[PDB]
Amino acid sequence: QALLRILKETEFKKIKVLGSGAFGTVYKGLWIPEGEKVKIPVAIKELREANKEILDEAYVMASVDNPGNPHVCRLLGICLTSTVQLITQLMPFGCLLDYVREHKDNIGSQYLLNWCVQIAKGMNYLEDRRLVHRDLAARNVLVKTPQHVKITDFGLAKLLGAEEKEYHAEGGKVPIKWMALESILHRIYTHQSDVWSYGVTVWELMTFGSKPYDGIPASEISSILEKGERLPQPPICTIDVYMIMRKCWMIDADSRPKFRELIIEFSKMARDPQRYLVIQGDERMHLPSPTDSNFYRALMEYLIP
Numbered sequence: 001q002a003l004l005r006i007l008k009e010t011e012f013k014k015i016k017v018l019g020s021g022a023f024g025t026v027y028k029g030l031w032i033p034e035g036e037k038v039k040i041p042v043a044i045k046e047l048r049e050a051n052k053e054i055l056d057e058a059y060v061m062a063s064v065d066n067p068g069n070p071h072v073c074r075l076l077g078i079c080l081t082s083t084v085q086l087i088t089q090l091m092p093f094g095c096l097l098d099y100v101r102e103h104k105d106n107i108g109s110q111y112l113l114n115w116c117v118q119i120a121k122g123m124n125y126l127e128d129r130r131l132v133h134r135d136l137a138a139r140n141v142l143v144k145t146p147q148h149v150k151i152t153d154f155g156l157a158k159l160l161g162a163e164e165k166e167y168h169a170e171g172g173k174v175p176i177k178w179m180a181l182e183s184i185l186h187r188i189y190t191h192q193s194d195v196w197s198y199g200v201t202v203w204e205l206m207t208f209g210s211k212p213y214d215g216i217p218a219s220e221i222s223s224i225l226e227k228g229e230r231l232p233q234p235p236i237c238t239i240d241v242y243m244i245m246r247k248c249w250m251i252d253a254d255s256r257p258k259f260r261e262l263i264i265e266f267s268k269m270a271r272d273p274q275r276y277l278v279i280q281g282d283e284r285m286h287l288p289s290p291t292d293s294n295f296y297r298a299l300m301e302y303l304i305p
């Protein structure tokens with residue numbers, strides 16, 4: 001059952017813009033609940049320009065909130081002022097796309113492989129709740145801590161009915177360079193087209209946030225994929241890691257890995273990370289962890305088809 005907590009605007013203080021983009025505008029703030037004096041750091045989202053879309057996103061998030069999962073973003077509630085806003089716990093390290101681009105020189109193999117495991121765990125949770133995300137990408141993964149990531153942005157996500165295996169889209173804007181070939185050609189989305197997007201997300205992490213098919217127009221992508229061309233092997237990836245990405249991009253959807261299998265394979269690689277990713281100076285790299293004494297110091301695309 002989907003239940004939204006409507007948080008009174010008078011409960012929020014110190015709201016400041018964090019940034020804007022295709023996702024709309026995100027602000028940070030402090031939520032002081034009624035009765036309790038706790039000051040909870042929150043992120044607040046508004047869409048660009050509209051109420052229909054953000055409420056649909058709230059519904060999807062509330063629908064999959066029970067039992068929930070550590071690698072899936074959960075909605076604290078919504079706020080009704082001049083716009084409808086979504087409220088969630090603030091992820092102080094931001095989105096994983098910007099994080100990999102900014103901390104490239106300190107991201108070791110263990111971190112990249114554990115992020116792959118965690119994103120697959122969050123997606124496996126969503127598949128069990130019959131949810132097709134349709135927008136998995138490094139820009140829609142958030143960093144709670146350098147060691148703990150969460151999937152966010154349910155703006156395009158759809159719940160499949162009990163007797164439904166696929167979602168047939170209309171003409172809304174969609175991320176072509178992260179989509180399976182069948183989604184580009186026939187507007188068909190399934191858990192296996194989310195696996196294709198997962199493969200593209202992994203490629204983004206392994207290249208430290210490179211743009212996929214950079215300088216290639218979205219209208220040429222279907223023909224590139226029908227010719228058998230795929231994103232290149234990242235220079236840190238051994239063949240075993242690249243072969244997982246290539247399996248995610250197979251034409252036959254049922255031949256692609258399942259999220260349950262990706263959890264197992266990436267967990268195996270995370271048990272011996274320097275065998276699977278070759279990074280110069282890997283053993284010397286460090287990122288802040290909540291187990292560190294000084295961790296508190298650290299806390300101070302879409303087109304019409």
Ligand SMILES: *CCC(=O)N1CCC[C@@H]1C#Cc1cnccc1-c1[nH]c2c(c1Nc1cccc(F)c1OC)C(=O)NCC2
Pocket residue numbers: 018019020023026043044045073074075086087088089090091092094095096097098139140142152153154
């Ligand atoms: C990639 C860059 C990026 O996401 N940001 C640059 C600065 C501003 C923005 C941020 C953020 C952030 C921080 N803390 C938590 C959540 C988010 C966030 N970023 C995005 C999404 C979210 N998620 C979010 C935000 C507020 C309220 C929510 F309910 C919620 O979850 C749905 C997002 O949904 N789309 C991508 C950017």
